[PDB]
C-alpha cells in the first residue's frame with residue numbers, strides 16, 4: 001500500500017507536470033513516504049516510471065480482455081483493437097509523460113532494456129489475435145511473431161504521427177489500414 | 187559558415203536529446219555565437235526547428251530521387267523507399283523530436299500551417315509511387331491520399347519504434363510489411 005500509494009501519487013504528478021518536472025522529493029512527501037522507502041521500492045524515478053507503465057499495461061490488457069467480447073472473430077478483434085488503441089490514446093493523460101520519458105531514455109540501453117519487456121506485452125495482444133486467427137482459418141500466417149511486431153508498430157505509427165486531423169478521419173484511416181493489412185495476409 | 191553551423195548543432199541537439207531537452211541557450215553557448223544573434227533567419231526556436239525539418243526533409247527526398255532509379259517497377263519502389271527509411275540519416279532520426287514539438291505546439295495555428303506543409307513532402311513519395319503504380323497497372327488504388335498517409339505513418343512507425351534492434355532484423359520486418367501492405371492493395 002505505501003508502495004501503491006507512491007505509484008498512484010507519482011502517476012498523478014507525472015500527469016499534471018510531466019516526467020522531467022516531477023521530483024521524487026514531491027513524490028516522497030505527497031505520498032507521505034520517505035526517500036528510503038522510495039529507493040527500496042524503485043531505486044530511481046526512471047524505474048518508478050517504468051513500474052507505473054507496467055501497471056498501466058496490465059489495466060490495458062484487463063480492459064481489452066473484457067472489450068474483445070464485442071468482436072466474435074479475430075478479424076474483428078484486429079479491427080477493434082487498433083481502433084481502441086487510436087481512440088483511447090487520444091485522451092490518455094499519461095501519454096505526454098511517456099513521450100517525454102521515451103525521448104529521454106532511448107539513448108541509455110539500461111532503461112531501453114526494460115521498455116522492450118513492456119512493449120513485448122503490447123505485442124502479445126496481436127500475437128494472440130494472429131495465432132487464434134490461424135486456428136480458425138481466418139487466415140494463415142506462419143511467421144506470427146513477425147507479422148505481430150509489424151502490426152504493433154505499424155499501428156502505433158498511425159496513432160502517433162497523425163496528430164492534426166479530426167478524430168473521425170483518423171478512425172476512418174486506421175480502419176482502412178486494418179482492412180488493407182488483413183487483406184495482404186491472404 | 188555561421189547560420190549553417192547553427193543549424194548543424196541544433197540538428198544534433200534535437201536528436202542527441204530532444205526538442206524541449208535542448209534550449210536556445212545551449213545552441214548558442216555551443217557555437218561560439220551569442221544570444222542576440224538569431225533573428226532574420228532564426229527568430230524563434232520553433233522557427234529554427236521547423237527549418238531543420240525542412241532541410242532534412244529535402245535532403246531525404248533528394249537522396250530518394252538519386253536512389254529510386256534502382257527500382258524499375260513501383261512495387262519495388264515501395265519496398266525500396268521503406269527499406270531506405272531505416273538506413274538514411276535524414277528526417278527519420280528526428281521523428282522523436284517531431285513528436286514532442288507536434289504535441290506541444292499544435293495549438294498555435296501559425297505552426298500547424300507550415301508544419302502540415304512539411305507533411306505533404308512526407309506523404310508525397312508514396313503519393314507518386316501509388317499514383318504511378320495505377321498508371322503502370324501494377325495495382326488499383328482509389329483513395330491514394332489515404333493509402334499514402336497510411337503507408338507513410340505505418341512505416342514511420344516501424345522505423346521509429348524499433349530503433350534498438352538488429353538493423354538487419356529491421357530490414358526484415360519492413361520488407362515483410364511492404365509485402366503484406368502491397369498484397370493488401372488488391
Ligand SMILES: N=C(N)c1ccc(/N=N\Nc2ccc(C(=N)N)cc2)cc1
Pocket residue numbers: 098099100102103116119120122123149152153156160285347348
Ligand atoms: N515492437 C516494439 N518494440 C514495440 C511494440 C509496441 C510499442 N508500443 N508503443 N510504443 C511506443 C513508443 C513510443 C511512444 C511515444 N512516447 N511516442 C509511445 C508508444 C512500441 C514498440
